[PDB]
Amino acid sequence: TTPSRAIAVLSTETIRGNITFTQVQDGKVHVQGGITGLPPGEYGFHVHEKGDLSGGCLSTGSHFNPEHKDHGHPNDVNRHVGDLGNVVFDENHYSRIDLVDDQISLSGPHGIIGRAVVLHEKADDYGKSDHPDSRKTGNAGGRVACGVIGIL
Amino acid sequence: HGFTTPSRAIAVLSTETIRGNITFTQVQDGKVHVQGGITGLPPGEYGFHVHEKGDLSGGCLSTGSHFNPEHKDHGHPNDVNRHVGDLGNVVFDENHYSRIDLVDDQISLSGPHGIIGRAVVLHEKADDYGKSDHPDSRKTGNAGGRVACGVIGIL
């Protein structure tokens, strides 16, 4: 029995959130969640390759990228498996997540169980700016919280 | 590119009082070498298990019960009648430090005994290996409350 459901918990002095992943549709994952703790705006949100928190958010590695593609927008053909775009915090510093993705999976080569979700300091530019980092990280800046993706 | 490198996993414990890293590496004939160090408890022995869910949303409770895909009873890690998650007790020294170093033949990094995405849980007291008369013994080892936990992630 491969899992049908997964969860990542973010927990910092300033940030608390749960992000759940449920395997739905035609090989699709439904990502739902809520986070508090950041001012209104958009913040890079990705599945990074490693669920190693021994060096904090930094040891989670880079964006999960088994297909060896470039950084892009989740609607692009050319993107990392772990590119889920940005999350949005509303004026009460709350973010609801409710999205559907068809690259990430709960099993197989695109499996994310054991990996990390990382919430970033600023907005992901989806691989579409002149900025030097754009094509690898989306210039989303530093890592503010991460949590290992565990079986739910 | 150097040598290619097989699958490992790691769980981190991190509390106001307790800190550790636990690493899992597959060795000969499919067994798992578990190693690492934890600091923060007085000299003694303490239950240490893989619990079924890697769900930390309600702290250590939401990790569920001992990982038990074969539906056995709680036992000693050297028993056949044990949960896959029954790694036993870890020992702390006079310096409040515990060196973990063991090989386990039930857990795996994949398959139906696969522990990736599951949780390691350190308990407030010793595991009695299901051998006592206390009502929780054959389920939990009477190891008590949960002092720290971590999701087992892909290293």
Ligand SMILES: *[C@@H]1O[C@H](CO)[C@@H](O[C@@H]2O[C@H](CO)[C@@H](O[C@@H]3O[C@H](CO)[C@@H](O)[C@H](O)[C@@H]3O)[C@H](O)[C@H]2NC(C)=O)[C@H](O)[C@H]1NC(C)=O
């Ligand atoms: C297990 O987790 C620990 C979490 O810290 C990692 O170990 C290392 O801890 C040392 C000890 O303090 C740190 O490095 C230090 O740097 C200073 C210089 O700034 C030096 O004076 C100290 O003597 C010490 O060497 C550091 O936070 C951390 N080092 C790293 C990231 O390698 C460790 O990585 C984990 N081990 C695993 C999972 O392999």
Ligand SMILES: *[C@@H]1O[C@H](CO)[C@@H](O[C@@H]2O[C@H](CO)[C@@H](O)[C@H](O)[C@H]2NC(C)=O)[C@H](O)[C@H]1NC(C)=O
């Ligand atoms: C993360 O999940 C935890 C654990 O469920 C949440 O705390 C619970 O939240 C639910 C609904 O928000 C409530 O029914 C309860 O108050 C809490 N648990 C129990 C057992 O009563 C927490 O709210 C979640 N965080 C976010 C922001 O989604």
Ligand SMILES: [Cu+2]
């Ligand atoms: Cu990232």
Ligand SMILES: [Cu+2]
């Ligand atoms: Cu336990």
Ligand SMILES: [Zn+2]
């Ligand atoms: Zn990316």
Ligand SMILES: [Zn+2]
């Ligand atoms: Zn048990």
